[PDB]
């Protein structure tokens, strides 16, 4: 079941879905979510609202919801592709192979282009994507490239996956989400500086991007850059309140700067204490 923001200021806002799209485009995720939720309220059965909601939620570094809203959308509109994709990435992040692969399998299923065309179930779906990919000789399919890079990640081949993502990115040089999947995949592939450039790109596109601030932080840790890791964690929470996992990371980086007063503030999740810090924000 989905937890809705109670007393939604925008519940009666007429253009709610459309408006949420505007806000989203302008990089405010929290308000975007408010408008999406309001949308769903005005029209419970409206699936696009659920799609964008789930996705946005994922970009909000709240995955738990992203999944519920996504499975909601697919419950209503089982053929929704953006949702199958997103939900696959999310099932990935939370380490469920059966389910990620399920949604990929079905993604292909509902995909008009691809209609025609320990663990070898995963392997089967991977081959499955690879073939159709090959069937597109010249022009590539960023969404297909996506699910494929995912399958590679999930399978463990990081270079392949990265290729898939630069591939997609070639078609959509501006997809902030994809720049994130890249950074995420490099960092996850223990190539951290690379990952950082990717994240920086994403955030240069959608500066409201929670998941990229987070991922970025993780990378900075991996680099031993701490003051910066923290800065990103804070900036994140500041934007998110406008997830505990972010808290967790922060607590860690902090522990590495060995800054005890601050670390205590963090252990308590006392946020404004941390704005400064040193004249931060």
């Amino acid at each position: 079941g989905y937890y809705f923001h109670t007393e939604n200021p925008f519940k009666d806002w007429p253009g709610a879905f459309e408006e949420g799209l505007k806000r989203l485009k302008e990089g405010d995720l929290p308000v975007t979510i408010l408008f999406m939720e309001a949308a769903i309220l005005q029209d419970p059965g409206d699936a696009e609202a659920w799609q964008f909601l789930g996705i946005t939620q994922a970009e909000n570094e709240n995955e738990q919801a992203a999944i519920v809203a996504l499975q909601r959308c697919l419950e209503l509109q089982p053929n929704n592709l953006k949702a199958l994709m997103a939900l696959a990435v999310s099932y990935t992040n939370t380490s469920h192979q059966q389910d990620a692969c399920e949604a990929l399998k079905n993604w292909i299923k509902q995909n008009p282009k691809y209609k025609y065309l320990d663990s070898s179930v995963l392997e089967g779906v991977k081959e499955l994507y690879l073939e159709a990919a090959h069937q597109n000789g010249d022009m590539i399919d960023p969404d297909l490239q996506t699910g494929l890079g995912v399958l590679f990640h999930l399978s463990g081949e990081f270079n392949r996956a990265i290729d898939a993502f630069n591939a997609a990115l070639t078609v959509r040089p501006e997809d902030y989400s994809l720049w994130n999947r890249l950074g995420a995949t490099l960092a996850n592939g223990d190539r951290s500086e690379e990952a950082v450039e990717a994240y920086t790109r994403a955030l240069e596109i959608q500066p409201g991007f929670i998941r990229s601030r987070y991922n970025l932080g993780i990378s900075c840790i991996n680099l031993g850059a701490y003051r910066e890791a923290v800065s990103n964690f804070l900036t994140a929470l500041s934007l998110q309140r406008k997830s505990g996992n972010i808290w967790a990371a922060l607590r860690i980086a902090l522990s590495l700067m060995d800054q005890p007063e601050l670390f205590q503030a963090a252990n308590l999740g006392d946020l404004d204490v941390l704005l400064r810090a040193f004249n931060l924000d």
């Binding site: 570094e61 992040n93 995912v150 993780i218």
Partner: peptide, 6 residues
Amino acid sequence: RLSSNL
């Protein structure tokens, strides 16, 4: 020791 989100 950590994991990045896609």
